[PDB]
Structure formats: C-alpha cells, structure tokens
Paper text:
We present near-atomic-resolution cryo-EM structures of the mammalian voltage-gated potassium channel [name].2 in open, C-type inactivated, toxin-blocked and sodium-bound states at 3.2 Å, 2.5 Å, 3.2 Å, and 2.9Å. As observed in other [name] and Kv2 structures, the voltage-sensing domains (VSDs) contain the membrane-spanning S1–S4 helixes while the S5, S6, pore helix and selectivity filter P-loop form the ion-conduction pore in a domain-swapped configuration.
Dendrotoxins are peptide neurotoxins from mamba snakes that bind with nanomolar affinities and block potassium channels. From our cryo-EM data we obtained a C1 map of α-[name] bound to [name].2s at 3.2 Å; this was done by extensive image processing and was helped by the larger size of α-[name] (59 residues as compared to 35 for ShK). The positively-charged toxin is tethered to the negatively-charged outer mouth of the pore by three salt bridges: toxin residues K30, R15 and R3 bind to three channel residues D355, D363 and D363 (D6’, D14’ and D14’ in the turret and pore helix). In the selectivity filter of the toxin-bound channel a continuous density is seen to extend downward from the toxin to the boundary of IS1. In the selectivity filter a large density peak, presumably a K+ ion, is seen in a somewhat offset IS1 binding site; a second, larger K+ ion peak is seen in IS3.
Residue numbers in the entry:
A (entry chain B), B (entry chain C), C (entry chain D), D (entry chain E): 138 to 192, 206 to 274, 289 to 421
E (entry chain A): 1 to 59
The structure:
Amino acid sequence: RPLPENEFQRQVWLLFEYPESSGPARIIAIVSVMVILISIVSFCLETLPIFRDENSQSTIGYQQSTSFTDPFFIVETLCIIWFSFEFLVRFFACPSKAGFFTNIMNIIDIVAIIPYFITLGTELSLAILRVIRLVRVFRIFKLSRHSKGLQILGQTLKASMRELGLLIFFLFIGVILFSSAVYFAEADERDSQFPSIPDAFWWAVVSMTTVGYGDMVPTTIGGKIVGSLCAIAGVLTIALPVPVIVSNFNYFYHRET
Amino acid sequence: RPLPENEFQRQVWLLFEYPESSGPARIIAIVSVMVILISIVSFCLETLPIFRDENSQSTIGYQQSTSFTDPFFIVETLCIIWFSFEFLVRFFACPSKAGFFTNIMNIIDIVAIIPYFITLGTELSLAILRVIRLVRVFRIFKLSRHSKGLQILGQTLKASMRELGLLIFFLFIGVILFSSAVYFAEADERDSQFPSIPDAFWWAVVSMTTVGYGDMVPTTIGGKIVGSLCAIAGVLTIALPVPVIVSNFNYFYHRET
Amino acid sequence: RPLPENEFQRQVWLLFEYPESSGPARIIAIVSVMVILISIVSFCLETLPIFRDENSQSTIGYQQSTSFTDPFFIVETLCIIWFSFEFLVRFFACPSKAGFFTNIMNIIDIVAIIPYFITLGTELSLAILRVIRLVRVFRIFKLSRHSKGLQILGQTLKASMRELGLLIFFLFIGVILFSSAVYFAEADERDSQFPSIPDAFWWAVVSMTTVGYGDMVPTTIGGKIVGSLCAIAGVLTIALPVPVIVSNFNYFYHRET
Amino acid sequence: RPLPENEFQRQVWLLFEYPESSGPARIIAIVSVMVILISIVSFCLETLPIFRDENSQSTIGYQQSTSFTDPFFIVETLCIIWFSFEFLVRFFACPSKAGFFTNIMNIIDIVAIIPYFITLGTELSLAILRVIRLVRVFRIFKLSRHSKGLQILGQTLKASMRELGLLIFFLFIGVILFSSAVYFAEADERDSQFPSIPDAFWWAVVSMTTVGYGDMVPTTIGGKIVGSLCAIAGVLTIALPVPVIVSNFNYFYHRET
Amino acid sequence: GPRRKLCILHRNPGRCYDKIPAFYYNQKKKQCERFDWSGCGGNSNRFKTIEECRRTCIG
Ligand SMILES: [K+]
Ligand SMILES: [K+]
C-alpha cells in the first residue's frame, strides 16, 4: 500500500495503520483494543437485570438524553466517539478513497458505528429496534484489525465457502430425513415430544451435533432406533467437511511464518 | 453417454439431462430444483398442528377429491405431476432403456413417484399407509441429480461400505457390553432408570455417541464407572473408522478438480 | 499352521478352524455365528420385565431343572452345549495342546463356557451370582473368531496399551482438577448439586467427554467458569491420544489388504 | 546435569533423582508415587459428608491438634512431612541452587508444600481459606516427576501457547456472538431461560463444546436457529486449533523414542 | 436439588390447543406446580397426577 505522500496524511496514516512503526502507533493500537473491549463489556452488562429493572431503558439498553445520567449511555457514547474519530481519520488519510469502502475491516467499522447513529436519529415498528440492538454486537469483529488469528479465520472462511455450504446442505438433508423418521416413528403416542416435523428439526439438529439437550427425547422403540441413526449420521456428516476446512485453516495459519 | 441419434430424442435428452448445454436447460434445472424444495416444504408443513387440527387428512396428509380444496393436496399433486413428466421424458429420451432402471438416480425418482400413486389407487391396514407416507420423504434425495456434493457423498458411502459396517458392528458390541454392565451394576435399586438391558441400549447409544440425552442416567457408583467407561469406549470406537471414511470422501471430493 | 497329521484330527481341525477350506467348514462357521447371536439375544431378553416378573429366575435369569420348562434355560443350554462341543473339538484337534491356552481367542471360549457350569455345579453369596451373570456377556467376544475387524481392533488395543494408559492418566488428572475446582467453587450453596469431590467425579467425567447428562450442573459463576474450562480441557485431553490410536488401527487395518 | 561431587551430596542426588540408577532409587520413586496417591485420595475423601458432618473440620478439611485424633490430619501430616523431606534433600543436593527455583518441577513441590504450613501458621477472612484449600489439589501435579506422559503434555502446552490462546479467543468471540443472538431472539418471553447475555454465556459455552446440559435451552424459532448455528460454529472453532495442538503433542511424544 | 433432567426443565405447554390439567416440577420454585398441557409435544417434565411428580422429583 502506497503512502499518502502529503507529508501529513502519510504521518497520520502510519500512526493509525501500522502499530509497529512507532511507539505512538503502538499506544494508539492498545487504546483502540481497550476501547473495543470496554464497549463489548458494556454491551453485555446492559442486559443484566440489576440495571434493566432498576432504571428506551429496555428497548435500546441506554437512555439518550442531553443530561446523560445513565452510565451505560456515557460509555456507549465515548466508545462511539472513539470509533467515529478513528474511522474518519482513516477515511481522510486513505490513499485510495475509491477502494476504501471495499476492505472488510472498514465495512466492519461502519456496521459497528451505524446503530448508535440510527437510534440517535430516530430519537430526534419495534422489531426494527430489537434488530438494531442485536447488530450492536458486531463490534466484536472490530478486533480483527488488531488480531492476526481473526484475519486467518476470516481468510479460511472465505476460502472454505464451498465446504461450509456442503456441510450446511448435508446437515439440512439429514435433519429433514431424521425429523420425518422420528415424527412418524413416535406419532401414535400421547406422551410424544415431537408434535410435527418442523418441531423435530430441533431434535435433529441437537442430536446430529452431539449436543443432546434432552428437552426432546424419543420414547418409542422406533424413535430410539431413529435417534441412534441420527447421532451416528450427524457425527459422520459433521466429520466430512471439517478436515477440509481445518486443512485450509492450517495452510493460512502457517503461511504467516 | 452418447446422444440418442433420433433427431428428436437427442434434443429432449440434452434439454433434460445437461443443464449447462443451453439456457432452457438451465431454466429447466432451476424449475426442477424449486419444485423439489417446494415439495419438501409442503411435506414438512403438512404435519403442523395448525393445519392438522383444523381439517384422511391425518393418515395421509391430504384429501383426494375432484374438487381439490386442500392447498397441500394441490401442491403435492403439482409436484408429483412435474416429477412424473420429468421421469417420462427421461425414460422416453434415454438411449439405453434396458440400462435406464439400473442407475440409482432413476430409482430415486421412481421411489419419490410411487407413494402418491399408491395412495391414489387405494382411495380409488393402517401401518402400511404410515410407512408409505414416511417413505414419501425420499424426494429429498432427488436433489442428488442437481447437487454434485450429494453425488460425492453417495460415492463415498458406496466405497466405504465395509468401514461403515465395521463401525456399526463395533457400536453394537460396545452397546451390548455397556448395557449389560450398567443394568447389572444398577439392578438392586428400588427406583432404577434401567428396567432391562434392551432399555439400557438407549443409554448406551446416547453415551457412546456422546449425545447424552439425560433421560437415562446411572445412579450407583458402579453405574457411574460403567458410564465413564462407556463414554470413553464410544468416542474411541467412533473415532476408529471416521478417518478412513473421511479420506474416502476427500479423495472423491478432490477427484473432480 | 501345520495340520494335526492324525489323518482324522487333521480333518476335524480343518473343518473347525478354516471356514473357507470347504463347504461344510463354511456351514459350521455360519452355524456357530448364528448360535452366538442367538445366545446374545437370549441373554438380552432374559432381563426383560415381561418374562422376569411373570416367571431363581431373577438371581441367574433361568431355572435349572430336569424338566427344563423355561425357554430361556433351553436356549442357554443349547448354546452352551454347542460352545462346549466346539471347544472340546478344538482342544482334541489342536496340534499344540501346550500352547492352546495361550491364545486369547480360546481364553474367550473358556470364559464364555465357565459361568453356566459354575451355576450348574453350585445348584447341586449373592453378589457373586450377579458378577457371574455379568461376565456371562463375554460370549459377545466369541465373534472375534469369525470377524476380521474384531481381530484388528484387538491387535490395535494390544499395540496401543501405552496410549490408552496415557489417555486414562490424563483424564484422571483433569477429572481430579475440575472436580476439586467445581466442589470448592460451589461449596457455599444450600442448593449446590455437588455434595463432595468424589460425587463431582461423575460431573467431571461426563463434561470432559462432552456427554453432559445434565444430572449434575454448576450453579455459581465460579462453577460455570470451572465447567467451561473442564469441557475445553476434556476435549483437548481426549483429542490427544486418539490420533495415535487411530494411526495404529489404520496400520493394522490396511495391513490385511 | 553433573553430580555434586561431594562424595555424599552426589550419592543423595543420584538416590533422589535417577530411579533407574539403583534399587533403592526405584524404591524411593515407588514410595513417592504411593505417597502422592495417598495424599490425593485423602484430599478427595476429606470432603465426604460421612466425615464432614461427623466433625475448622469443614473450612480446612482437618483439625490441627497435638493429639491428632483425626485420621485425615494424620495422613496429611505424614504426606507433607515426606514432601518437605524430599524437597529439602533435593534443594540441599542440587548442584546449582541458583537455578533450582527456575524449574517448574520444583515450583510444583513448593506450591504443594505451602498451604499446609500457611494453615499451620494461621492456627498459631474465609475466602482465603477456601482458595488455599482449592490450591491444595496441586500435589497431583507432583506425579509429573515420575511420569513421562505428563512431562510431554507440559512441553506440548508450553509449545502450543499461541494455539491455546487462539482457541480461547475464538471461543470467546463465538460465545459473545451467540449469547447476544440467543438473548435477543428469546427476549420477549416470560419463560425465557436467558435473563441476560452474561447468563447466556453458560448456554454458549455448553452448546459450542457440545456438552449440552439442557439447563438453559432455546424455545423460540429464532432461538432454535441460533442454537443450531452455535453448535456448528463451536464444533468448527474447536476443530480448528486442535489438530495443531495434536501435532505438537505427537512430535513431543515420538521424540523420546 | 439435582434430580433427573426430567426435573431440571421448564414447562412446555405444547403445540396444540387444549387445557389439560397437568403437573410439572418447577425448580425455580423448588416445588410442583399445576399447568395446562396442550395435548401434544411438551417435554418429560410432565405428569398426570401431582403424587407422581412429587415422587420422582423430590423423594
Ligand atoms: K452432549
Ligand atoms: K444432556
């Protein structure tokens, strides 16, 4: 990547892009990491009943007001201010403005920055607000800028898209098969825990993944046989694409050194 | 695989066999795929209590009549008519009609076609109808024609028959052993979760596969020791032939490219 | 593999030792396989409450009497007399009688034959009878004679003794660690599900193996952290020796071909 | 390492360092192994309600008195006396006392020795006592001196620190993501088992590891979808660095031979 | 109390439309409570009479 060459844009770009270049760059990287971690902790703690009950305060998790009495709103505002400053500096110092919005890291930053401003504009349909609150957890992906392992995992996911799709397709086929089998095998009972095939989807996904929650369990002998087959076939189906994905991850992992 | 050479059968065979040959072939492939998933969705949704209680419609899932008031029957008959049209075209355009019935991909179509016509002839024994409606789910395998990964999985299953049988045999031996151990270790208890060894088969199969449903759980010290041994032996037994089957799948998966 | 050389002992040894040698040898092998399977089925059905309650019949599962009214006793007697006849033929046709008792495939036959005669002798302590009835399940290992996969598994177990011991040692160390951690982290709770460290051994063994029956579950935050660490460390611990054992099994499996 | 060369320090060092050097050295090694096992058994049995209720004796697990009537305190005193004698001999016979404390094998001895003397000095805050009694279990790590497998595992853990950190980081990211998803997808429910995202952390760690206790289980359709995705992603993120850790373990394991 | 998972479970009325007077053990309340079962689905944390729920969730 070429330097900005402006003699001041280049300095800011080096400061905010390559932490190893200088001491100030390293401290800026550490500050950004700590800010992201603080934002994640605040987002997770907003949902605790201690603050939720003893308080807008539940639809968004923070009270948007000029006074800004709520500590959660203060922390979120500070984190969003830091994120906005960082993104604006990077966008103003990016040598290629046309190609700036193509990198996945900048899209991640924009996704982590939008919901706060969307809520602020709205304050100036309820499921939309819940979805906006839910997508506020995507700032955990802002750590991919400072973590090399996260970048390796992202490259592995990009390269192993076909294997992931094959795993999903095989899982769906097995889930449909075993859900139908267990619904029809355990249908002539009043104590049946499978009311329909779409409900048996939960049992199929739980059994194939070897999770075994136990909330839904077959009772009839045919149900038990179907459950055995579901467990074995789920083990096999999961184990088929996983070695390919792991080989891709190892190739991208040891490529660094 | 050569063309029929009839100057008219060849065109239909190319249209209904090779999607990449032309645009109409691709649109026919997409239509077939959409019909298959529509049939799968209809079959899964026919079991929901919303339509089942507000409805014969419970034994077969649809009402066969000239009026055709039931939407599920309409969807099922449209999917079956498309399947029959495709099968008749493929049978009348196949250059080798003698070898047509040997391919598994055509046996799958025949199996997905038969149960609807069997029910129609019957309405034109109760467990027989239930098992027929169960084997109605085998149209999910009709996606193997349009999906390459499903064909690789089928070839892997064909090639790894001995290893699959070995896995089943080892699982059976371990299940018998640990069911006997857990029954006899926890037999002198007034309230025991294992009435007999055949009922302990369920606990064994959910412990070896590490699903652990929790419906059957050992209580006495000997039962707990047997359960830990069952978990270890089951994970080892499963891990024994899984790498062989995975190697077979990977060989068939990288064979295309 | 020398023949007995008696001109009649050699024929008997060939008949009862090499199934592929002649048609009668294959018939004898199939008959023996069916006899072992029948014995296993009878042993499993002996415990069913249908026959157990509607019957002596509970201490040993069958009633030893001259009339022999119990069908289970008749089946067990037939299987045992076939086993004894086969063992006597093998012992009287073995070229090396001194080394006959060294092969574990014959120790299996003696172990499967003894308990019936032990009960017969004592018919003409209560836990001893239960232990005898438990070791009566070892006739499932008589299939190793007619199964190459079982022999391969036995050779793998013999070769991988050190790895199995290392797996057991690692699992025991992890279980002690996490049982102590979960007992002390959830000790100041009236509703705590861990009465003691030996009782937490069960939770540790089922969590490290990802079985998770759910009977014992941590409740406090420290208990939850301890449980997560236990699960992760158990996955790692089990995953360590398994590739070595699998490599041993693969070497012993592809050696035959 | 060279002998001390004192003609008496060297003899003691060889006696207490190389079990294969002489018969007395093997005797001392077996005695140390048995003493460590006895200490572990006594520590685990101190928590049984048979002795704990029939008792100070609950906060520390033993009662310090001159009479020493409690068998657990007698056993612990003997074990600690042996450990202190062995540590003193090894520290007085170590050729390089400056480098003696750098070895982790002697840090293990010091850590296993301190709690008893700390409680003894206190006899002559309550959570501190619980933490001390928790770290009292680290004498199980004293088996690493007499077992090569534990040394191999320690070297593997030392070499695989980056992969362990990557696994922990990936687990944390997935846990945060799926906890937020399952909380927001199952928030508008009175019977929701996820009061908050930090509470859903337990469900996330249980699902991703596929332990599946079932104490917290999704109910809404979005919850079921999130749970299935959580199981899949947890399986994948466990399977990513485990092969690298396994390769490290195998390299350290076959290096000895 | 650590009883069977049959007891560590939340009430699931089912997917049907009925008000069957069943009894389920609530661990949060540490006791058995009456609830309305729809007549299908549900989980093992379901009993016909309170006597059996108190039997095999308390002892
Ligand atoms: K599980
Ligand atoms: K479970």
